[PDB]
Every structure is written in C-alpha cells, then in structure tokens.
Amino acid sequence: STECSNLLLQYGSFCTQLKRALTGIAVEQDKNTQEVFAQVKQIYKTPPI
Amino acid sequence: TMSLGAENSVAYSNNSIAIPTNFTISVTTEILPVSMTKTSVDCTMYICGDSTECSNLLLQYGSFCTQLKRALTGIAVEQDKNTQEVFAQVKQIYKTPPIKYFGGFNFSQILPDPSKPSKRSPIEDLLFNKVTKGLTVLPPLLTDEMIAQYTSALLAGTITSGWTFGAGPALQIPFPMQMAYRFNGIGVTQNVLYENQKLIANQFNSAIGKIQDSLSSTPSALGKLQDVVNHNAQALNTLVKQLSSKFGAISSVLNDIFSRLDPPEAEVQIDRLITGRLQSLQTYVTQQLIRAAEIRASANLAATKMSECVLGQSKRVDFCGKGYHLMSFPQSAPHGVVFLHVTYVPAQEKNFTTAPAICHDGKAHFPREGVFVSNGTHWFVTQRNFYEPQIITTDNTFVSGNCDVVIGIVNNTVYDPLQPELDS
Amino acid sequence: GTGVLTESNKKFLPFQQFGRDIADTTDAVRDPQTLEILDITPCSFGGVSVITPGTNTSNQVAVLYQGVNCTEVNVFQTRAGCLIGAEYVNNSYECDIPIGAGICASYQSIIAYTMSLGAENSVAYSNNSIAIPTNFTISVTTEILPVSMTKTSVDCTMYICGD
Amino acid sequence: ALGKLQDVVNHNAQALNTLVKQLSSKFGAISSVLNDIFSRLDPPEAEVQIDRLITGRLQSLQTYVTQQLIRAAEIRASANLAATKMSECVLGQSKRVDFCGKGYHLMSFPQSAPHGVVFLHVTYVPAQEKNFTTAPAICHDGKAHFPREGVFVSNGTHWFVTQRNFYEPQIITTDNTFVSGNCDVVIGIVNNTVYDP
Ligand SMILES: *[C@@H]1O[C@H](CO)[C@@H](O[C@@H]2O[C@H](CO)[C@@H](O)[C@H](O)[C@H]2NC(C)=O)[C@H](O)[C@H]1NC(C)=O
Ligand SMILES: *[C@@H]1O[C@H](CO)[C@@H](O[C@@H]2O[C@H](CO)[C@@H](O)[C@H](O)[C@H]2NC(C)=O)[C@H](O)[C@H]1NC(C)=O
Ligand SMILES: *[C@@H]1O[C@H](CO)[C@@H](O[C@@H]2O[C@H](CO)[C@@H](O)[C@H](O)[C@H]2NC(C)=O)[C@H](O)[C@H]1NC(C)=O
Ligand SMILES: *[C@@H]1O[C@H](CO)[C@@H](O[C@@H]2O[C@H](CO)[C@@H](O)[C@H](O)[C@H]2NC(C)=O)[C@H](O)[C@H]1NC(C)=O
Ligand SMILES: *[C@@H]1O[C@H](CO)[C@@H](O[C@@H]2O[C@H](CO)[C@@H](O)[C@H](O)[C@H]2NC(C)=O)[C@H](O)[C@H]1NC(C)=O
Ligand SMILES: *[C@@H]1O[C@H](CO)[C@@H](O[C@@H]2O[C@H](CO)[C@@H](O)[C@H](O)[C@H]2NC(C)=O)[C@H](O)[C@H]1NC(C)=O
Ligand SMILES: *[C@@H]1O[C@H](CO)[C@@H](O[C@@H]2O[C@H](CO)[C@@H](O)[C@H](O)[C@H]2NC(C)=O)[C@H](O)[C@H]1NC(C)=O
Ligand SMILES: *[C@@H]1O[C@H](CO)[C@@H](O[C@@H]2O[C@H](CO)[C@@H](O)[C@H](O)[C@H]2NC(C)=O)[C@H](O)[C@H]1NC(C)=O
Ligand SMILES: *[C@@H]1O[C@H](CO)[C@@H](O[C@@H]2O[C@H](CO)[C@@H](O)[C@H](O)[C@H]2NC(C)=O)[C@H](O)[C@H]1NC(C)=O
Ligand SMILES: *[C@@H]1O[C@H](CO)[C@@H](O)[C@H](O)[C@H]1NC(C)=O
Ligand SMILES: *[C@@H]1O[C@H](CO)[C@@H](O)[C@H](O)[C@H]1NC(C)=O
Ligand SMILES: *[C@@H]1O[C@H](CO)[C@@H](O)[C@H](O)[C@H]1NC(C)=O
C-alpha cells in the first residue's frame, strides 16, 4: 500500500533504527564465527601416512 | 572466493622434532573499550519542551519518566564502576626512579612525558589524538589525568617490582632478573636471557617503536573505541531527530496543535506526540542498556587482562597476545585501555632426530626437563623452547625401567659426572 | 515558543526567516517588524542534582547545577557544573559521594574535594638490589557474587484487564 | 558488605512495585478504571478508551519484560563467573592473578547466600621484606652459575641462594645451581665460591 507507506513516513526513522540494529546483529554473527574458528592464518595439513 | 590462508603442510614424522634456535620479542596491541558516554535525559523537557499543558498531560502516564531516568542513572554509575574496576587496581601510586635505566630496556614511549602538560606517554598522547533539548552528557568521574596517573602507577609497579606489587607489597627487583623470571615462566632457562640481554633489549625497543609507528600510520587501528563514540553520538542524534516526527499528527509542534484545533482533538494530538516521543525515548534507553551490557562485559574482560597480563604472567594461550606471554603494559585511551603485550615468539627452528628415551646399561633414561635431540651423529638433551644442546648425563636424566618397554628407544651412552672423580 | 532573544552574528540570506541548528531546533529568527537577526537561546536549563547525606544523619544539602556557570544561577565551579552549598577543601580523601570530573563530596558541613587515587609510594629500584620476604600473612577475603534472581510470573490478562 | 544481593532483591521488588503502580495511569483516556469506561460510554468510544488503557498497560508490561531480560543476562554473566570461580578457586588452585583474592591464591571456600554465593579466598601475602644485594650469576672457576629455582642474595659479606617468595638462605652449591658458559658474557656477574658436596 502506497498510502500506508506515506502514513508510515510520518513516524520518522524507526525503520532505519530497526534495519541498523539488524545489520549490527548480522555483522556480529560473522565476527563471532571469525573469532571462534579463524584463529590460524596458515592452513595446516596432516601427513598422508 | 575468500582465501582462508596459506597452505602449510607440516613435515610430521615419528622421529623428528623441530627446535627453535632463536626468538623474537614481539609487542602487540589489544584495544578494549571500558566506558561509554554518560547520558542523562530530562523526560519532561524532551517530550514536552516548555508547554505546561503537555507536562500536565504527561503526568497522567505515571512513572515512565522515573523508569527512564533510573535506567540512565544506572548506566551512568556503571560506566564509572567499569573505569574504577579496570584502572584502579592498585591503592598505592608507584613512581619510577629518576635514573630511568632498566638494563638496556627503553620505556620512554610508555612512561609519562614530563614535557607535556597532560603528563601522558607518547603512545597515550597518540591514542588520545587518534580518537575524535533535555539531553545532557555527564562528565566521567575519573578524568584523563587520573586514569593516566593510574596507568603510570601500574607501569611503575610492573617495571620496578615485577608481579610482586599485584599480590602484596612491591618488592624491588632488577629488570633483567625480572625478565629472566618471566623467561623461566614460559619454560626458558634464565641463562638464555642473561647471555642475550642486549639483543633482547634491542628487540623490545624496536618492537615498541614499531608499535608507535603502526598506531600512528593506520587509521583503523583504534576503530573499537571510535565505534563506541559513534554509537553514542548517532543514538543521541537519532533521539533528537525523533522530535521532528509528526507520529501521525497534523504537526510536530505542540503550539500549532493548541492554536489550530479545539481541546477535544488537541488532547488526542498531544497524546500521539507524547506516546511517540516516549516510545522513542524507551527505544533509546533499551539500546543504551544493551550497549551498556556489552561494554560492561568488555570492561570485565579488560579488568581480567589488567589483573592477569599486567599484574602477573599468564599461562593462558592467546589471552595476553600472540606467543608465549612475558609481560604487558597498560595505556589509557579515550573510553578504553590499550594493552601492549610483550610476548616471546620462537624463530629460526631447526630439524633434529628425536627419541623418547636413551638406552644405557640396560636402563631407560628420560629427560628431567628437556628433550633428546640428535644432529646426525651425536645425542644431546636440550630445553624444549630453545636450542641449547648439552651432554646427556645422569644429572639431567632420570631412570625408569629397562629398555624393553619404551617404543623407539635408541642406544646411546650416558655420561657420569662422578666417574672422573673416583677415577682420578 | 519561549526563549532568550539575543543579538545574532549569523548572516541570514534576505529570503530566510527562521533558523535551525544541527539538531533541527529553532535557534535563530528574524523579527517581522525589524529586519535584524535574533538568536533564540533556550532559557537556561540545567539539571539540579542534590547532594545529601542520610536524613538520619543531617538535613544539609548541596545543589549541583549541571553545565551552568556559577555566574548564571560556598559556591564552587566544577567541570560538571556549579556546586552551591559545599566548601572546597584542598585536602584529598576517598570518594564518598561522586560529583564528577574528579570532584567528590562528603559530610564531616558538606565538603567537596578532589579525590585521592592512593597513598604515594616510591619503590626503591636499583640495578643490583632485591627485596625478599621474610614472613607471610594468611589473608582470607570475601567475594560476593549474585547467582539467581526472583522468578516472576505475570498473568497478562489479569494485569491488563482485571475482572 | 552484602550490597550486591540486596541490590538484586531491591531491583526485583522495585520493578514489581513500578509495574503495579503503572495501573494508575490514564494513558490518555478519561479514566484509569476499565469498569467506569464500560459504565459510562457507548461501545464505539468506550472501545477506543479501553484501547488507550490496553496499549499503555501492554507497553508497561513489555518494558518490564525487557528490563527483566537485560537483568537476566547480567545475572547469567555473574552466575557464569561464579561457576568459573567455584571450579577454579574452590575445586583447584588458580595461578590467575586476582581471580581468587588479593595475593597468591592458596584455596577457597564456598558459602551459600540469598540469591548468591560468597567465596572466602584464602591467599598467601608476603610480608616483612628485607633488602639484599643481588646478582644474576656467580662466577666460579671461569664458569657462570645460575640458580635452578631460587635467586642469589647477599647480606653484605656472604652470598647465598634463596627461594624467591620466602627468605631462606642456603649455601651456593652445585646441587642448586647450573653452569652455562663462562663469566665474560653475563652482565653483572660477581665472584664467589661454589661449594661442591
Ligand atoms: C625439516 O625437514 C622437512 C623434510 O624432511 C622439511 O620439509 C620440507 O620443506 C621444503 C621447503 O619448504 C618443502 O619444499 C618440502 O616439501 C618439505 N617436505 C615435507 C615432507 O614437508 C622442513 O622444512 C625441515 N624443517 C626445517 C626447519 O628446515
Ligand atoms: C637471532 O636473531 C637476531 C635477530 O632476530 C640476530 O641478530 C641480528 O644479527 C645480525 C648479524 O648477526 C645483525 O646484522 C642484526 O643487526 C641483528 N639484529 C638485532 C636486532 O640485533 C641474531 O644474530 C640471531 N642469533 C642467532 C644465533 O641466529
Ligand atoms: C629511548 O628511546 C627514545 C625514543 O626511542 C630515545 O630518544 C631518541 O633519542 C635520539 C638521540 O638522542 C633522538 O634523535 C630521537 O629523536 C629521540 N626520540 C624521541 C622520541 O625523543 C632515547 O634516546 C632512548 N634512550 C634513553 C636512555 O632514553
Ligand atoms: C653434532 O654436534 C657435535 C658437537 O657439537 C659434533 O661433534 C664435534 O664436531 C666437530 C666438527 O668437526 C669436531 O671438531 C669435534 O671434535 C666434534 N666433537 C666430538 C666430541 O666428537 C658433531 O660433529 C655434530 N654432528 C654433525 C653431523 O653435525
Ligand atoms: C641396542 O642394544 C641392545 C643390547 O645392547 C641390542 O639388543 C640386541 O640385539 C641383537 C640383535 O638385534 C640381539 O641378538 C641381542 O640378543 C639383543 N640384546 C639384548 C640385551 O636385547 C639392540 O639391538 C640395540 N639397538 C640398536 C638400534 O642398535
Ligand atoms: C631498601 O633500601 C632503600 C634505600 O636504601 C629503602 O628505601 C628508602 O626507605 C626510606 C624509609 O621509608 C625512605 O625514607 C627513602 O625515601 C627510601 N629511598 C628510596 C630511594 O625509595 C628501602 O626502604 C629498603 N627496603 C627495606 C625493606 O627496608
Ligand atoms: C612472622 O609473623 C608472625 C605474625 O604474623 C609472628 O608471630 C608473632 O610472634 C610474636 C613473638 O614471637 C608473638 O607475640 C605474636 O603473637 C605472633 N603472632 C601470631 C599471629 O602468632 C612471627 O614471629 C614472625 N616471624 C618472624 C621470623 O618474624
Ligand atoms: C651473613 O650471613 C652469614 C651466615 O648467614 C654470616 O656468617 C656468620 O656470622 C656469624 C655472626 O656474624 C658468625 O658467628 C659465623 O661464624 C658466620 N659464619 C660463617 C660461615 O662465616 C655473616 O656474618 C652475615 N653477614 C652480615 C654482614 O650480616
Ligand atoms: C673476578 O675474577 C676474574 C678472574 O677470576 C677477574 O678477571 C680478571 O681481572 C683482571 C683484572 O681486572 C684481569 O687482568 C684478568 O685478565 C681477568 N681475567 C679474566 C679471565 O677475565 C675479574 O676481574 C674478577 N671480578 C671482580 C669483580 O673481582
Ligand atoms: C617410524 O616410521 C618408520 C617408517 O615410517 C618405521 O620404519 C619405524 O619403525 C618407525 N618407528 C617407530 C618407533 O614407530
Ligand atoms: C518597520 O517598522 C520599523 C519600526 O520602527 C521601521 O523602523 C521600519 O523602517 C519599518 N519598515 C521595514 C521595512 O522594516
Ligand atoms: C648498576 O649501575 C651502576 C651505576 O649506575 C653501574 O656502575 C653498575 O655497573 C650497574 N650494574 C649492572 C649490573 O647493571
């Protein structure tokens, strides 16, 4: 609904706040995975035997 | 597709060991946020400004204003508590000797500068340079000068007294002997420190200079503290921006509502503006509480690092820098602490042929503190973290059992110190 | 609105009437009768904080006006604001009531002071001397840690609507 | 002394008292009593007034749940810390500085408390320190001797080796020292005899 969006614009930057918080959580999850698993900068390999 | 890293196939075999023949004194930086901006919001002035009728209507909502003020007050006292926990870990203000010679070790970049009015270190001064309506910002309880004084006291204690001041009275010890104690902590004998004292001092000075250059040359080094400042400022800006939102009313200005509409509809319009502004303020307070919890966790971690890396030597892997931890130095930073972790990194490793035990006289000998290595023709025992080959004797080995049980035992002679004495 | 109308150094363009700052609040205006520019500085708001000991002990209070200079309101100027009713003492004690910017208040009348960080100790460092303990103290210290809270359940229908 | 636990009890009681107090708020309606609203207005406008009350009370309840969840996260972090202290200070001896009391940690005792745990940390604090003249190594027979586990001290005329955390002087022998290199490299080496058993 275009009229609903026009009425929704009157409420300000609530939508921007919610998107920014979700973006912060989204980058935080990748940072968490990077901190836990990427603790080595060399990819070691086991011997064949 | 992102590259995880360089492939490194380690040459594992059942009888070969790699022993370091050299070391690098590496100083690394760890930046931890400690406190946030202390914000106080006047609920009446934010929601209503100066309108008396708006305040009268606002009184009907009860203790929302008290809840928001109480939550912000809790966050504000929490920030001061966080700073107090991280930096005020000593009750004695220690001072360095006037003759600042510590065995070839240079601490000019981290000790306070007498020439500067702020009494800060060159590194701390660089850190401070590199970090840049009903609403008020409260000053922190501890000023930058007092936090710098606390860091100076911690540096003086950790330089002149080692880790003794953190566990009781400060006991003076020469800095090379302290560095030898720290070498013993990571399993390297003190002779390695004493013989290479000039090289270790030069490496430490070079690393400290590299740290200052690296901080001065990288814009994104101090992003973690900057983000906190940015998050606080942006949140404050957004909260004020919410005042310019109609929230589904004819106008965002209360006076326009009083002048343009009758009181039966005016009360509805002011109610809409009040609920919108109150919801904005509640959203801001909720964000502040979540960020305060995150900063409190970071401050607790910083206090743990201050206790375990600066006031003692830590055996925890990667807690106090990459490598075997030797010592740490605290530096004050805007809303945060920077730890300079001095660690020992092994380097210039060499292959050797290794065995679990030495078979001599039908007895199995095992190293008391080291490892058996062979350069190809001769067998020696050396400490695990530095290559220092020594003759296999009965003083650095112990006997447990015969040679029939241990898998991979090799035959070699074991010298007896007592044998030439009774022989002669 | 309500405000203090002062002379303005802001050079308006001839078509502009009102003025806004960074925070989108009306802070400049042009009088309709006179084509001069006037700043609308908001009336001198401040947070009034009351520093008091327990009412069991005394009824004396001190007033801190946050972010207000002392000439615009036992008067002391702090970076937090103006403190009235407390007398600055050049001595340093432990912090009893935190004021801010290194200032703390205590009751002994109400005094305000710069809090001491710690007792001053100079370590006798030299390159060939060590200090060895000859005795020990077995010290038992307390650490209090919260573990759980009160478990609360709320009847949503009864709270919102009752009967 | 027990301010933290009493503080938690105070926050929970204060949050409940505030939540009860919030029922006395009109929330932009004619009355804060729902029964009055029914007894006084037709359903088209009474529905609106009851709505005003319902949205205000629901906002109050969601606010209370939000602070309860934030306090739950804080208490969960404190409880995780308490479990770590119970595991590492009570069930073992910790080398972590200031984790289990001020001083060198010996052992710890747990005590139950209302909504909490009290740890009695038994620690070792050095006291009655004394100055001594110290050296990195002892030069004997052209060889450098270093302490195996202690430190070289001198009371003015005689050299001894003692453990670092307590003064117990012992004669410098080959049993408690090790030889690495000659005397030409170590900075600050002093000349003293090394006894042979
Ligand atoms: C120890 O020996 C192994 C092999 O005996 C060395 O591993 C080789 O290193 C070269 C140089 O990069 C590689 O090209 C080979 O592919 C490696 N071989 C294996 C089987 O991994 C190893 O470099 C030696 N260690 C040191 C410190 O010299
Ligand atoms: C161990 O490594 C250090 C450097 O990490 C070496 O010191 C360098 O030695 C070369 C020549 O011997 C000099 O040109 C450099 O200036 C030295 N660097 C520093 C920082 O002093 C040292 O020689 C190495 N030792 C061994 C036994 O390999
Ligand atoms: C310790 O380090 C500082 C800084 O690295 C040294 O100060 C430098 O001294 C040289 C020669 O005197 C000057 O050319 C540099 O400009 C100085 N740098 C700075 C930042 O001031 C200092 O000489 C070193 N030694 C001692 C004993 O302090
Ligand atoms: C392994 O190390 C030992 C000792 O460092 C070496 O033995 C010495 O080698 C030198 C080199 O010619 C001789 O001059 C000495 O006489 C040897 N000493 C003894 C006691 O025999 C040995 O050569 C090394 N082996 C390898 C393969 O490098
Ligand atoms: C190490 O020495 C032992 C004994 O000195 C060797 O064991 C002997 O091995 C031979 C042939 O393998 C047998 O005939 C003997 O009966 C064994 N004697 C004993 C007492 O076990 C052993 O082989 C040697 N190992 C190496 C690698 O040379
Ligand atoms: C070890 O000796 C030093 C200096 O000989 C002592 O330090 C002095 O202590 C006195 C007494 O408090 C002070 O007045 C001096 O200012 C101190 N001098 C310095 C340079 O700090 C130290 O107290 C002695 N240690 C012990 C345990 O007696
Ligand atoms: C080490 O300190 C303890 C006290 O911490 C000393 O014990 C005291 O000794 C005196 C005289 O012998 C008694 O009057 C006290 O009652 C003792 N105190 C306690 C708590 O038992 C001990 O003598 C000190 N040792 C040394 C060598 O100085
Ligand atoms: C340093 O300590 C040693 C022993 O701990 C002292 O040597 C003894 O001193 C006593 C009394 O002075 C004599 O009766 C002994 O015969 C000495 N023993 C030896 C083996 O000589 C020494 O006097 C102390 N030095 C100082 C300056 O106090
Ligand atoms: C410790 O003893 C060594 C020798 O046992 C002394 O070294 C000699 O000192 C003299 C004069 O200083 C020189 O002429 C010799 O060439 C040195 N010999 C050696 C092998 O270095 C040393 O000076 C003594 N140190 C002290 C502090 O007494
Ligand atoms: C080590 O490996 C080699 C070949 O991989 C084998 O011949 C030898 O017996 C092994 N030694 C031990 C002690 O396992
Ligand atoms: C408006 O009235 C003021 C009042 O004295 C007068 O001075 C001015 O000339 C008038 N006209 C304009 C255009 O300002
Ligand atoms: C200690 O300092 C003095 C003078 O500062 C010097 O003569 C002496 O050699 C130094 N000793 C050591 C071990 O550095």
3-state secondary structure string across chain B: CCCCCEEEECCCCCCEEEEEEEEEEEEEEEEEECCCCEEEECHHHHHHCCCHHHHHHHHHHCCHHHHHHHHHHHHHHHHHHHHHHHHCCCCEEEECCCCCCCCCCCCCCCCCCCCCCCCCCHHHHHHHHHCCCCEEEECCCCCHHHHHHHHHHHHHHHHHCCCCHHHCCCCCCCHHHHHHHHHHHCCCCHHHHHHCHHHHHHHHHHHHHHHHHHHHHCCCCCHHHHHHHHHHHHHHHHHHHHHHCCCCCCCCCHHHHHHHCCHHHHHHHHHHHHHHHHHHHHHHHHHHHHHHHHHHHHHHHHHHHHHHHHCCCCCCCECCECCEEEEEEEEEECCEEEEEEEEEEEEEEEEEEEECCEEECCEEEEECCCEEEECCCCEEEECCCCCCCEECECCCEEECCCCCCCCCCEECCCECCHHHHHHC
3-state secondary structure (DSSP) of residue D57: helix
- At residue D164, φ and ψ (nearest 5 deg) are -70, -35
User: φ and ψ at B92, to 5 degrees?
Assistant: -120, 130
Q: How many helices (H) and strands (E) in chain D?
A: 3, 9
- Asked if residues D64 and D72 have their Cβ atoms less than 8 Å apart, the reply is no
In 10 A of CB B404, how many CB atoms? 9
Tokens found for residue A45: 């390999």
Distance CA D45, CA C80 (A): 50
Residue nearest to atom 5 of ligand 6 (CA): C124
| Residue B242 to residue A21, Cβ atoms within 8 A | no
Q: CA-CA distance, C76 to C104, in Å (whole number)?
A: 12
Across the interface, of D24, D180, D187, the residue whose CB is closest to B62 is: D24
Distance from the CA of D197 to the center of ligand 8, in angstroms?
20
Pocket test for ligand 5, best of B358, B379, B407, B411 (most atoms within 8 A of CB): B411
**D20 CB contacts (<8 Å, ≥6 apart)?**
none
Element (H, E) at D108: strand D104-113
Instruction: Count other Cβ atoms within 10 Å, centred on residue B229.
Output: 16
Cα angle C98-B79-D114, degrees, rounded to a multiple of 5: 90
Per the DSSP assignment, residues forming a β-bridge with D126 are C136
Give B69's contacts in chain D (Cβ within 8 Å): none
Is residue B384 left, alpha or beta, with left meaning phi > 0 and alpha meaning psi from -120 to 50? alpha
Q: Are D8 and D75 in contact (CB under 8 A)?
A: yes
Q: Note whether A41 contacts B5, CB cutoff 8 Å.
A: yes
Cβ atoms < 10 Å from Cβ of A46: 8
Report d(CA B376, CA B351) in Å as an integer: 10
How far is CA D155 from its chain centroid? Answer: 39
Cβ distance A42 to B248 less than 8 Å, yes or no, reads: no
**Ligand 7 in reach of C139 Cβ (< 6 A):** no
**Residue owning the nearest CA to atom 13 of ligand 2:** B199
Q: In what order do the strands lie in the sheet with C87-88?
A: C87-88, C110-114, C103-107, C97-100
Let me know: does D84 contact B301? Beta carbons within 8 Å: no
Whether ligand 3 lies within 6 angstroms of the CB of B212 is answered as no
Contacts of C75 (CB under 8 A, 6+ apart): C82, C83, C84
Query: Residue C106 forms beta bridges with which residues?
Result: C111
Q: What is the largest CA-CA distance in chain B?
A: 121
Tell me the residues of chain D between 117 and 176 that have a Cβ less than 8 Å away from chain B.
125-127, 129, 134, 136-137, 144, 146-147, 151, 164
Residue D163 CB–ligand 8 contact under 6 Å = no
Question: Is the Cβ of B294 closer than 8 Å to some Cβ of chain D?
Answer: no
DSSP character string of C101-136: TTEEEEE--EEEEEPP--EEEE----TTEEEEEEEE
Hey, are the CB atoms on C134 and D130 less than 8 Å from each other? yes
> E-strand spans in chain A?
42-45
Please tell me which of the candidates D16, D153, D166 has its beta carbon nearest to residue C152.
Answer: D16
CA pair distance B68, D116, nearest whole angstrom: 28
Backbone φ and ψ for B7, nearest 5 degrees, come out as -75, 140
Please work out whether the CB of residue D191 comes within 6 Å of at least one atom of ligand 9: yes
- Classified as helix, coil or strand, C65 is strand
Nearest CA in chain D to B171: D129
Cβ pair B92:C133 closer than 8 A: no
End-to-end Cα, chain D, rounded Å = 57
- The Cα B158–Cα B307 span in angstroms is 11
Task: With H, G, I as helix, E, B as strand and everything else as coil, classify residue D72.
Answer: helix
Q: How far apart are CA C23 and CA B134, in angstroms?
A: 12
Query: With an 8 Å Cβ cutoff, are B141 and C1 in contact?
Result: no
Backbone torsions φ then ψ of B160, nearest 5 degrees: -85, -25
Distance CA B82, CA B34 (A): 6
Q: State whether C131 and B143 contact (CB < 8 Å).
A: no
**Residue D121's beta-bridge partner residues?**
C141, D108
Distance in Å, alpha carbon of C14 to nearest chain D alpha carbon: 44
Task: Answer whether B92's CB lies under 8 Å from B170's CB.
Answer: yes
Closest residue by CA, ligand 4 atom 23? B377
Q: Are B367 and B390 in contact (CB under 8 A)?
A: no
CB of B407 sitting under 6 A from ligand 10: yes
Q: Give the separation between CA B37 and CA B138, rounded to whole angstroms.
A: 8
The DSSP bridge partners found for residue B329 are: B340
Give the number of the ligand closest to the Cα of residue C14: 11
Q: Cα separations (Å) of B340 from B31, B224, D62, D90, D123?
A: 9, 16, 44, 32, 29
List strand residue ranges (DSSP E) for chain C, in order. Answer: 4-7, 18-20, 26-30, 37-41, 47-51, 62-66, 75-77, 81-84, 87-88, 97-100, 103-107, 110-114, 119-122, 129-146
Scored b (16 or more CB within 10 A) or e, D149-184 reads ebbbbbeeeebbbbebbebebeebeeebbbbbeebe
- Using DSSP's 3-state secondary structure scheme, residue C84 falls into strand
C-alpha C42/C-alpha C140 separation (Å) is 57
Cα C17 from Cα B178, distance rounded (Å)? 72
C-alpha angle D73-D77-D80 in degrees, rounded to nearest 5: 135
> What is the number of other CB atoms lying within 10 angstroms of the CB of residue A32?
10
- How far does chain A reach from its first CA to its final CA, in angstroms? 66
Residue C81: both structure tokens together: 């604001």
- Among chain B residues, CA nearest to D81: B300
**Looking at chain C from residue 52 to 71, which residues have their Cβ under 8 Å from any Cβ of chain D?**
none
Identify from B39, B41, B80, B138 which residue to disrupt to test chain C contact, counting C C-beta atoms within 10 A and taking the largest count: B138
3-state secondary structure at position D105? strand
Q: Which residue has the tokens 């743990």?
A: B304
* B14 close to A (CB below 8 A): no
* B142 touching C (Cβ < 8 Å): yes
Q: Say if D63 is an interface residue toward chain C (CB within 8 Å).
A: no
Q: Name residue, tokens 């204060």.
A: D14
The span from the CA of D178 to the CA of B381, in Å, is 14
In three-state secondary structure terms, C100 is strand
| Contact call for residues D194 and D145 (beta carbons, < 8 A) | yes
Instruction: Determine the distance separating the centroid of ligand 12 and the alpha carbon of B103, expressed in angstroms.
Output: 9
Q: Which chain D residues contact residue B66 at CB under 8 A?
A: 18
CB contact under 8 A, B241 and A17: no
Ligand 8 center from residue D178 Cα (angstroms): 25
Q: Taking CB atoms and an 8 Å limit, are B167 and D127 in contact across chains?
A: no
Which one of D61, D115, D165 has the shortest CB-CB distance to C154? D61
Closest-CA residue of chain B to A38:
B4
Question: Angle at Cα B149 formed by Cα B144 and Cα B151, nearest 5°?
Answer: 95
Look up tokens 């030495």; give the residue.
Answer: B358
Method: cryo-EM
Separation between Cα atoms, residue D100 and residue D96, nearest integer Å: 8
Does C124 contact B at CB distance below 8 Å? yes
Say whether B141 and C125 touch across the interface (CB within 8 A): no
Residues D2 and D113 sit within 8 Å (Cβ to Cβ): yes
Query: Which residues have CB under 8 Å from B144's CB, separation 6+?
Result: B118, B120, B128, B332, B334
Last residue before each gap in chain D (C to N over 2.5 A):
none
Residue with tokens 């636990």: D5
Is B411's C-beta closer than 6 angstroms to any atom of ligand 5? yes
Nearest Cα neighbor of B17 from B424, B375, B289, B365 is B375
Taking the Cβ of residue A43 and every Cβ of chain B, the question of whether any pair is shorter than 8 Å is answered with yes
Instruction: Characterize D68-94 residue by residue with b for buried, 16 or more Cβ atoms within 10 angstroms of its Cβ, and e for exposed.
Output: bebbeebbeebbebbeebbebbbeeeb
